């Protein structure tokens, strides 16, 4: 591989990472209180769980994975239309909601073995959808339906979380969930998986992420890494660094990475829901007391975002400046 993609020695993945047998698989068609309790325990203990029987159509999940794979099979001349000034965009503020192809890495500077298509999904209007990929022909109609369905499921999970925390229903149905970035991640085959990463170890900086995968490669940090079993009809729920802050660390954030594969490509669909850049983030005042003092001072999501996207010296570098008590 090009030296551009060689990860620092300490960040390289070991060849045989064990399956995470303790990753919760939560059936959302259980009794209401059982679902609230199981989600609450997974959020407190792990910060990563899968949901099944989640009410999002399996056919739509398959059609969305199909059109996302079809997008990454498009020729160079079509993909260039999503490369501003002839190169992929960078994950840096301002992060526009129009569709672009993105490159990503860490500044021992290296690049992740990944192409990412990203666009906003909420609210859906003509202007936003007209800024999505023109090809494949069905991308806009399928992904518009998918984005509405994934948002509906995310808001159901956030209300289960509200009941678990003792927050009013709809606590996150406001500025805290107004940005919905859909990241379609393409991991092409890699000649040297021992030296590369599809995605470096990170928290998602946002509130909550729903991740759809068909193939292995996702791993979670529990300094032990475990493999997250791909269930093609499930969503992986990753709690974001923003939710870790708002719950005053009552909930864990998911630290996860993606390893490369020597033989096969892989596509994942990540729906990253979180605050507008104008939001102030702080521990929910409703949950604080002398027994539970705030562990973070209030901060600008925009200010956090700049650090989160630039400084990868530690997983929570984004929130370190705002730590108190
Ligand atoms: C692997 N990378 C991580 C960092 C960056 O994330 C973002 O770009 C999100 C997009 O919502 C963001 C979150 C919070 C603040 C700023 C940006 C791009 C991708 C994501 O999959 C997660
Ligand atoms: O490809 C994956 O399974 C992980 C994707 C991801 O972590 C992300 O988009 O933030
Ligand atoms: Fe992620
Ligand atoms: Sr180019
Ligand atoms: Sr257009």
């Amino acid at each position: 591989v090009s030296e551009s993609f060689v990860a620092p020695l300490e960040k390289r993945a070991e060849n045989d990472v064990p399956l995470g047998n303790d990753v919760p698989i939560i059936d959302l068609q259980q009794d209401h209180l059982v679902v609230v309790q199981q989600i609450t325990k997974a959020c407190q203990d792990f910060g990563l769980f899968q949901v099944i029987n989640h009410g999002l159509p399996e056919k739509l999940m398959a059609e969305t994975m199909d059109v996302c794979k079809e997008f990454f099979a498009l020729p160079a001349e079509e993909k260039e239309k999503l490369q501003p000034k002839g190169e992929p965009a960078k994950f840096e503020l301002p992060l526009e909601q129009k569709a672009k192809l993105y490159v990503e890495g860490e500044q021992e500077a290296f690049l992740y073995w990944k192409d990412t298509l990203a666009h906003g999904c909420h609210p859906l209007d003509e202007e936003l959808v007209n800024s999505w990929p023109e090809k494949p022909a069905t991308y806009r109609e399928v992904v518009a339906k998918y984005s509405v369905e994934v948002r509906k499921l995310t808001m159901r999970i956030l209300d289960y979380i509200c009941e678990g925390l003792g927050l009013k229903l709809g606590y996150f149905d406001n500025e805290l969930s107004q940005i919905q970035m859909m990241l379609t991640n393409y991991y092409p085959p890699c000649p040297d998986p021992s030296s590369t990463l599809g995605s470096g170890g990170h928290y998602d900086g946002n509130l909550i992420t729903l991740l759809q995968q068909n193939l292995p490669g996702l791993q979670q940090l529990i300094a032990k890494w475990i493999a997250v079993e791909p269930i093609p009809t499930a969503f992986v729920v990753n709690l974001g660094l923003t939710l870790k802050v708002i719950t005053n660390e009552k909930f864990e954030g998911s630290i996860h990475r993606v390893v490369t594969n020597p033989t096969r490509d892989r596509v994942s669909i990540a729906t990253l829901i979180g605050p507008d850049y104008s939001c102030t983030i702080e521990p929910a005042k409703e949950l604080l007391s002398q027994d539970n003092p705030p562990l973070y001072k209030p901060y600008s999501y925009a200010e956090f975002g700049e650090i989160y996207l630039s400084d990868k010296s530690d997983y929570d570098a984004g929130v370190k400046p705002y730590k108190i008590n």
Side-chain angles (χ1 to χ4, degrees):
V1 292
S2 173
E3 289 297 298
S4 296
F5 294 101
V6 175
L9 180 59
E10 71 279 3
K11 294 197 175 208
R12 293 173 197 171
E14 289 304 333
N15 290 317
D16 300 297
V17 170
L19 266 172
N21 299 321
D22 302 329
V23 172
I25 312 299
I26 303 176
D27 182 352
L28 296 197
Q29 287 187 21
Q30 291 174 107
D31 299 346
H32 174 83
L33 187 53
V34 169
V35 174
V36 169
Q37 288 167 338
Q38 287 188 4
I39 286 174
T40 296
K41 292 167 77 194
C43 289
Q44 285 169 356
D45 293 340
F46 300 111
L48 186 160
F49 55 96
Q50 310 213 44
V51 291
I52 65 169
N53 303 328
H54 45 56
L56 194 148
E58 290 190 3
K59 192 171 86 84
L60 181 59
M61 293 182 75
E63 287 167 350
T64 305
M65 181 61 78
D66 285 348
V67 78
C68 289
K69 286 169 69 186
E70 192 179 359
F71 170 84
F72 272 108
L74 286 172
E77 68 172 328
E78 197 61 21
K79 289 181 175 176
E80 285 297 346
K81 293 165 192 196
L82 296 175
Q83 285 177 48
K85 303 193 178 305
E87 61 180 279
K90 312 212 174 290
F91 292 109
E92 56 172 24
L93 305 187
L95 191 66
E96 295 187 304
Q97 291 201 38
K98 64 178 71 181
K100 310 175 186 183
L101 280 165
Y102 289 80
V103 60
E104 195 178 4
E106 315 195 355
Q107 232 291 15
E108 302 165 280
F110 75 108
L111 296 174
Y112 300 159
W113 195 270
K114 173 170 72 72
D115 297 322
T116 296
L117 170 70
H119 54 80
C121 301
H122 181 79
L124 281 181
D125 59 22
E126 193 190 317
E127 181 169 320
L128 178 54
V129 176
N130 281 350
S131 70
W132 289 6
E134 298 187 342
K135 292 187 187 280
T138 60
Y139 184 95
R140 288 176 188 189
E141 57 195 284
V142 173
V143 171
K145 289 188 295 192
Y146 181 82
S147 68
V148 167
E149 284 279 356
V150 168
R151 189 176 182 80
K152 188 167 66 180
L153 173 54
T154 302
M155 303 317 293
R156 279 184 59 196
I157 292 164
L158 284 169
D159 266 356
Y160 289 140
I161 279 166
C162 285
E163 188 169 329
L165 289 165
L167 299 176
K168 70 187 184 66
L169 293 180
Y171 190 89
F172 299 102
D173 183 19
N174 56 28
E175 55 264 21
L176 293 178
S177 63
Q178 279 322 288
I179 298 291
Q180 182 175 341
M181 295 301 292
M182 184 167 151
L183 275 61
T184 304
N185 304 303
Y186 179 61
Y187 309 93
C190 182
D192 189 12
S194 74
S195 304
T196 62
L197 293 170
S199 202
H202 66 282
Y203 295 100
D204 292 352
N206 51 293
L207 187 72
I208 188 165
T209 300
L210 265 65
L211 174 60
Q212 184 186 332
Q213 58 165 357
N214 280 1
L215 287 173
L218 177 63
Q219 303 182 348
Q220 186 188 357
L221 180 67
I222 64 162
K224 265 206 76 214
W225 293 90
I226 60 86
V228 181
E229 172 195 3
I231 306 168
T233 56
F235 285 91
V236 178
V237 181
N238 283 315
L239 299 197
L241 194 46
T242 300
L243 188 56
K244 184 188 183 182
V245 168
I246 292 175
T247 69
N248 209 39
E249 299 195 354
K250 176 171 162 82
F251 284 5
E252 298 279 13
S254 169
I255 299 168
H256 53 274
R257 76 184 180 190
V258 181
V259 297
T260 59
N261 184 285
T263 58
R264 53 172 175 201
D265 61 1
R266 174 171 180 278
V267 170
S268 69
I269 308 164
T271 298
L272 281 71
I273 281 165
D276 191 54
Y277 301 102
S278 65
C279 284
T280 300
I281 312 302
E282 60 184 293
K285 292 157 101 74
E286 292 85 356
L287 302 178
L288 298 179
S289 62
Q290 286 299 327
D291 279 301
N292 183 35
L295 297 176
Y296 302 89
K297 69 180 191 173
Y299 61 84
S300 161
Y301 191 65
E303 198 175 78
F304 157 79
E306 190 180 78
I307 303 169
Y308 170 68
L309 292 175
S310 68
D311 184 351
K312 289 177 187 190
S313 59
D314 221 317
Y315 300 121
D316 72 346
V319 296
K320 278 172 96 297
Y322 314 114
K323 290 187 177 184
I324 56 163
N325 288 308

